[PDB]
Amino acid sequence: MDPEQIKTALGSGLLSFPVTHFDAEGRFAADSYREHVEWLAGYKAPVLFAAGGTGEFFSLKPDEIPTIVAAAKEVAGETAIVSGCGYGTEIAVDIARSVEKVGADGILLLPHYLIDAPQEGLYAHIKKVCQSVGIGVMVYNRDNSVLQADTLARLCDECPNLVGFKDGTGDIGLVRQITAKMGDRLMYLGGMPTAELFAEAYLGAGFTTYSSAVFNFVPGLANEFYAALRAGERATCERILVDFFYPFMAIRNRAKGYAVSAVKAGVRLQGFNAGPVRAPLKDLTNEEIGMLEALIGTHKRKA
Amino acid sequence: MDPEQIKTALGSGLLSFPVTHFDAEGRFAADSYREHVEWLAGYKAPVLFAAGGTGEFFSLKPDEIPTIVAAAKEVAGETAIVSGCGYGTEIAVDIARSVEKVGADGILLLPHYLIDAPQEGLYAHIKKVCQSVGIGVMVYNRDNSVLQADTLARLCDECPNLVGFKDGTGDIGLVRQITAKMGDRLMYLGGMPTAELFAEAYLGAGFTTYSSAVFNFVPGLANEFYAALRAGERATCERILVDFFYPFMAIRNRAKGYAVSAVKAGVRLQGFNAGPVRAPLKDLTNEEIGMLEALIGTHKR
Amino acid sequence: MDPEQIKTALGSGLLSFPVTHFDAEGRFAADSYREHVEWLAGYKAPVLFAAGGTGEFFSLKPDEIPTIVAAAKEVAGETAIVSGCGYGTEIAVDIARSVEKVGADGILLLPHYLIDAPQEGLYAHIKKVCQSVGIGVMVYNRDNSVLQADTLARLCDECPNLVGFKDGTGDIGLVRQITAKMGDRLMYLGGMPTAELFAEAYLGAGFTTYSSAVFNFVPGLANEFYAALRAGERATCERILVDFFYPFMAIRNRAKGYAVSAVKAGVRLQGFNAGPVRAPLKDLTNEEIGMLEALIGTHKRKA
Amino acid sequence: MDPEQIKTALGSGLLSFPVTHFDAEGRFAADSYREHVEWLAGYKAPVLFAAGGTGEFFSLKPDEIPTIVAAAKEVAGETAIVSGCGYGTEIAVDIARSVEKVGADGILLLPHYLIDAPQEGLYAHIKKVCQSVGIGVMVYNRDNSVLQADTLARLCDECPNLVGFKDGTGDIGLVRQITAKMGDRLMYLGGMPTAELFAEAYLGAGFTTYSSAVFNFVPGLANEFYAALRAGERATCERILVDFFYPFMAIRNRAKGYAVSAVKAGVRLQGFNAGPVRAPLKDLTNEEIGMLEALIGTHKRKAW
Ligand SMILES: *[C@@H](CCCC(=O)O)C(=O)O
Ligand SMILES: *[C@@H](CCCC(=O)O)C(=O)O
Ligand SMILES: *[C@@H](CCCC(=O)O)C(=O)O
Numbered sequence A, C: 001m002d003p004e005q006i007k008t009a010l011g012s013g014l015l016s017f018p019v020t021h022f023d024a025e026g027r028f029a030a031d032s033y034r035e036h037v038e039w040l041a042g043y044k045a046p047v048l049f050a051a052g053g054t055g056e057f058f059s060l061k062p063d064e065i066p067t068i069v070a071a072a073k074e075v076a077g078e079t080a081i082v083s084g085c086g087y088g089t090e091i092a093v094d095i096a097r098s099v100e101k102v103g104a105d106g107i108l109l110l111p112h113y114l115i116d117a118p119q120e121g122l123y124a125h126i127k128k129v130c131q132s133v134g135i136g137v138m139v140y141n142r143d144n145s146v147l148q149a150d151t152l153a154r155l156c157d158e159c160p161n162l163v164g165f166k167d168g169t170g171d172i173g174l175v176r177q178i179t180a181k182m183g184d185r186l187m188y189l190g191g192m193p194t195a196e197l198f199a200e201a202y203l204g205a206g207f208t209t210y211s212s213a214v215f216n217f218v219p220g221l222a223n224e225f226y227a228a229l230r231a232g233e234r235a236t237c238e239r240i241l242v243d244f245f246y247p248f249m250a251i252r253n254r255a256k257g258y259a260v261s262a263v264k265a266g267v268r269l270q271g272f273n274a275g276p277v278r279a280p281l282k283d284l285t286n287e288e289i290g291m292l293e294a295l296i297g298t299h300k301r302k303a
Numbered sequence B: 001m002d003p004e005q006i007k008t009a010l011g012s013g014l015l016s017f018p019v020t021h022f023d024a025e026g027r028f029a030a031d032s033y034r035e036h037v038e039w040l041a042g043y044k045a046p047v048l049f050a051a052g053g054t055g056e057f058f059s060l061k062p063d064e065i066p067t068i069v070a071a072a073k074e075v076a077g078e079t080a081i082v083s084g085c086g087y088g089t090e091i092a093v094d095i096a097r098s099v100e101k102v103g104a105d106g107i108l109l110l111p112h113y114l115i116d117a118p119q120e121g122l123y124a125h126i127k128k129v130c131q132s133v134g135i136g137v138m139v140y141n142r143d144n145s146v147l148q149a150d151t152l153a154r155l156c157d158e159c160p161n162l163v164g165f166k167d168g169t170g171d172i173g174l175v176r177q178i179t180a181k182m183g184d185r186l187m188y189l190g191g192m193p194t195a196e197l198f199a200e201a202y203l204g205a206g207f208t209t210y211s212s213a214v215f216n217f218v219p220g221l222a223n224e225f226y227a228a229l230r231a232g233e234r235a236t237c238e239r240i241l242v243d244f245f246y247p248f249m250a251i252r253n254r255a256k257g258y259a260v261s262a263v264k265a266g267v268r269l270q271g272f273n274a275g276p277v278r279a280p281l282k283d284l285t286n287e288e289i290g291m292l293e294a295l296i297g298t299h300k301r
Numbered sequence D: 001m002d003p004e005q006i007k008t009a010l011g012s013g014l015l016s017f018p019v020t021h022f023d024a025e026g027r028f029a030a031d032s033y034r035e036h037v038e039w040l041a042g043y044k045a046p047v048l049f050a051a052g053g054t055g056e057f058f059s060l061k062p063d064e065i066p067t068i069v070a071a072a073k074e075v076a077g078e079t080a081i082v083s084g085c086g087y088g089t090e091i092a093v094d095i096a097r098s099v100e101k102v103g104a105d106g107i108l109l110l111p112h113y114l115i116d117a118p119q120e121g122l123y124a125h126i127k128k129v130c131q132s133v134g135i136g137v138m139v140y141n142r143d144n145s146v147l148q149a150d151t152l153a154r155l156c157d158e159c160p161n162l163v164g165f166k167d168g169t170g171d172i173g174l175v176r177q178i179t180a181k182m183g184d185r186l187m188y189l190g191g192m193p194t195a196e197l198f199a200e201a202y203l204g205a206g207f208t209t210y211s212s213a214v215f216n217f218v219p220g221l222a223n224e225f226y227a228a229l230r231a232g233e234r235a236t237c238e239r240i241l242v243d244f245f246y247p248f249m250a251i252r253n254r255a256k257g258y259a260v261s262a263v264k265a266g267v268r269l270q271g272f273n274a275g276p277v278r279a280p281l282k283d284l285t286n287e288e289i290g291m292l293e294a295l296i297g298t299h300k301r302k303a304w
C-alpha cells in the first residue's frame, strides 16, 4: 500500500486500535490476538492500528512489534494495517523499517521519549523517521511532542509520505488552525482517549473520524455512534453519550492508565483472553470489572 | 425583563462585550462609552455585557459597575444589557442587587476571588448570588471556578433564574457533557478569548452561540463570520480565520492580558476615546498598535 | 509603627494568621475573635496577620476589614498587627488606607483579581498601592501575581516602605534568586499552606521566618517545632512532621480549600467559637473533625 | 562493587553526568569521550554517571549504552561508574543486565516511557528492574514517574539493592517527606537541571548531595561552589550564583532542551569535541555559543 492509498483508507470510516494480548506470564499471546482481531474484522473498520497506545506500544520490546503486526495481518483481510512507532530517532527508525518489512501499510509515530524539545528538533526527528521508510506516516500530537501548524506545514512540504495527523492534546484552537492551514494535505484523526466524547466538536474542527478504543469490546455500539455522527442524528449520539460513554468515563477516571486498562478489561469480559496489562499500568479491581460488566449489559457477547 | 426573556435574547445572535472607557484622570468615561455602545447596537448584537471580562470587571470598584450599566442602558436601544458580577459571595450579592436596581437585564457571574473551592462550595456561593435577585443569571466556567455537570444541574433545579452557561475553559470534553446533560434548560455561550477560533467546534458541542471580543472594533467582520458560520459557509469562515483571526492571535500572544489590551487598542484606532487599560494590564506598544492598525486595514472606520 | 520597625518585628519570630470568626448567620463575631486572639498572644508571636488568607480575606467585604483589624489590635498587646489587602489597584488602595487609619502596622498585599498580567503591569499595580500608605508593605508571590527578581528589585528601589516578601509559590529556584539578589533589603517570609513542611528548606534558601497556620489551634506545637528548627534540632523537627504534619496533610488534602477549613475546624475543637467558613469554602464533615480531633490528641486544650 | 559500597560512594562528594560525545555523523565518539572523562577524573568526582540525561540517554540505542559505559570505565580510575537505564520494563531490564555485564557499579533508572501511571504500576515496574540485577539501583523522580513516600518505602523493604533517590521535580514538600520517612535507608541526590540553584534548600531538606551538569565544562567552579556549600560559606555560594549560575540560567532558558545543549556547548568551548546533540534537541546558535564563551571568561581551559 502506497502513502496515498493508506491516506484514502484513513478517511473511509472508523479507526480501531486493538489491545495487545498477553499470557499470564506477560508474553505476547498471538492466538488470542488473532481471534479478537478476526472478530473485530466482521465490523469492517477500514484501518487497524497494530501496537498503538491502546495496544500498549509503550511497553513493547522493539523486536516484539513486527511479530504483533504480522499476527494482525494474517486475519485482518482487506483492512489496512498501521503499526505504532516511537521513541527517539535511532530506535524509531529501526522500528519503522522492521514493520515496513513485515508488510505494514503505514506507521503511527508516537512521541519521542522523556524530553521537551524545541520545534526545530521535532521537525528534525520526524523528517528522518519519515525518510527512513516508503510507507505512509501519521504524526501524533500529544504530551512532549506537539507540532505547531507552521512546523507541520514544513514537514508536509518536505515529506510526501506524511499523510495523516492524530490529535491527543484536546487543543481545539490549535487543531482548527492546523486543518485550516493544511486542508486536504492531511487526513485528520481524533485520538483523545474515548474520542466519542470529542467527535462532534472535532467534526466542526474538520475531523470526520477518530480512533475508538471502545470498539475493542463494543464495536456494534461504536459503529452506531459513528453512523449517527456522520448522519447528523444528534439525539442518537446524545443518548449513546449519556447511556454509555459518560458512565464509562467515570470508570476510566478512577485511576491513571485506565484509558488502556478499562478497554482491555472490556475485551476480557466479552470472552477474549486478552490477559493482563504490563506494568506500570495496573489492571482493574474485581469491583471495577463488575461495574464495567454491568455497563456493557445488553451488549454482552456471550454468557 | 424576566429570566426567560433574557434567555431567549441570549441565544438570538452574536454577543458582544464592550470595553470600559477611561480618561486621563482615570475615572470611567461615560459619554465616550455611550457613543461607543451606541455604535455597537447599530450592528444589531441582541445582548451587551457591560463591565464583563473584556470590560475589565476585575479592575472595577463595586460602586462603578452600576454607573457603567446605566450608561450602557441609556443608548442600548433594543439590545438587552447584562452586567458583570463577581468577587466573593458578600460583595457579589451587593453588586448583583445594585445593578438589578438600575435595570440590568441579567448577571454574568465571573468567578470568585483567588481561592480554589470544592464543588459544594461553588454551589453555595452561586446559589446565594442567584437567590438575591430576580433577574437572570449566567454562570461562567473558567480558572478557579469550574462547575461540573452534576453540580450545575443541581443549581438549575434550585434556582429557576439561572438561565445561561458561559465557557472560558476550552475544556471541550466537559462542555459537551454539560450540554448533553442539561439540554435546553440552559443557553450555552462560547466565551474563549477570541472565540471565533473555537466557534465551529463549540457549535458541534451544541452551543447556542458565542461572544465576539473583536466585535468591539470590527463588528462588520465579526458579523460576516457569524453569518457564514450559521449558514455553513466553511470556506468563508476559513478565509476570515486565516487572514484576520490567526494574525490577531499572533499580536495577542505577544504578552499577557492582551486579550483585553489589544481589543481596547482596536477600539481607539477606530476613533473611540476608550483610553488606557488599568493596571495590572498594560497597553500595546506603538509597534503592536501599528501591527493591529495594519491588520484592521480595509475595515478602518 | 514605621516601615523599618515592622520589618524588624517580622524577622524576630514565628508569625501566624488568625482565622476570622463568624457567627452562624454570619458576620464578624468580635467577642470570639478577641478571646481567640488573646489566647494566642500568650504564645508570644511578634507579628500578627489580621484578615489574611487563613483569615479568609478573599471572602471579606472591604468594610469588614478595618473592623477585624481594630478588633485584633485591641487585645494584641505589644504584638504587631499586619492587615490583609488585595483585589484590583483601586479597591486595594481603599483597603490599604482604611486599615492604616485604624492603626495597622503594615499590609500584606495579596494577589490582584482573576487575570494574568505582565511584569510591568504587576509593577504599576504594586507601586501605586505602596505609595498610597506610609506603613510597611510585604508583597505576596502566589497564583496570578508572581514577581521575578528584576521586577521586585525595581519596586524596592522605588518604594522604601516595601520591606517584606511572602512566598506562596513553592518555586525554590525563584525564591533563592530573590534572596540572592536583594540581600537584607527585604525580610523573607515562608508562606506555603502548612509552611512547616517547607521550613527546613526555606532556611537554606535564606528565609528569615515563616507563617504557621496551625499556630491557631496548636501554638505549643508550632513553638516547639520553630524552636528546634532554629536550634538545629533536626531529629525533633523530624518527629513532629512524621507525627503531626504529614498526618494533618492527609486530611488537609481531602478537599480543596481545607488549608483554611481544617485549620478553622481545629480552632473550634479547642473551644474557640470560630463558626463556619464562608462559601465557596466548605467545612469538614463530622468524620473529618473526628479525624482531626484524634490527631490533636495530647495537644488538646483543657480547662 | 556491591550496593552498600555504591551507596557510600554516592554520599561521598559532588556527582556528575558527562555528556555523550558524537561525531558529525551522530555516531558515538569514544576517543573524545574518554579524553573528556579523563579530565573530569582529575577533579575527583566520586561518582560518574555514564549515559544519564545530561549524557542524552533518551537518544541512545540500547545497544550503545554498554559501549559508552565501557569507554568511561577505561579512564575513570577509582571513580564509581553508574549507568543510565530507562523506558518500560522489558527494555529497561535488558539494558540493566547489559551494563551489569560490562561492569557498571550501579544504574540510574530514568522514568518509563510516555504514560502517566498509577503508584501500583510504578511499584511493579521498578521492583522488576531492581530484581533483574545485583548491582545498586538509584530511582529518579521526574515527570511521568513520581513515587510517593509510601510507595518508595515498600520498594525499599522489598529491594535491598535499591540504595539511592534522585529528584527532578523540585517538589520540596514531597522530597522532605521522602527523607523524613526513609532516613539513611537511602542516599539523596539533588537532580534539577542546574542543581546549584537548588543546593542550599535541598541540604536543608536533608539531601545527601547533588549532581552538577556544569561540572562538565567548569568543574573548578562547580567544585568550589560545592566546598563552600558544605562549609556554610554562604557569601561564596551567593557570589557564584549571581556571577555565573543565574547568567547561565538565562542562556539555558532560551529554548527547550538547552539544559543539555548548553552544557554540551560549554564542553566544546573548553576544547573537547563533544560534537552535536541528537534530534530532537537542537544545538545553541553561534550567537548563543558566543554568550556562553564570554560567561565562561576567566574559567577558560584553553585559548582558541
Ligand atoms: C491512540 C488512540 C488513543 C486511545 C488510547 O490510547 O486508548 C493510540 O492508542 O495510539
Ligand atoms: C467573557 C468572555 C467574553 C469575550 C468576548 O467579549 O467575546 C468576559 O469577557 O467576561
Ligand atoms: C539527571 C540530572 C539532570 C541534569 C540534566 O538533565 O542535565 C540526569 O542527567 O540523568
Ligand SMILES: *[C@H](CCCC(=O)O)C(=O)O
Residues within 6 Å of the ligand: C017, C052, C053, C054, C055, C191, C192, C193, C194, C195, C211, C212, C213, C214, C259
Ligand atoms: C498566608 C499563608 C499561610 C498558609 C499556611 O501556613 O498554612 C496567608 O494566609 O495569607
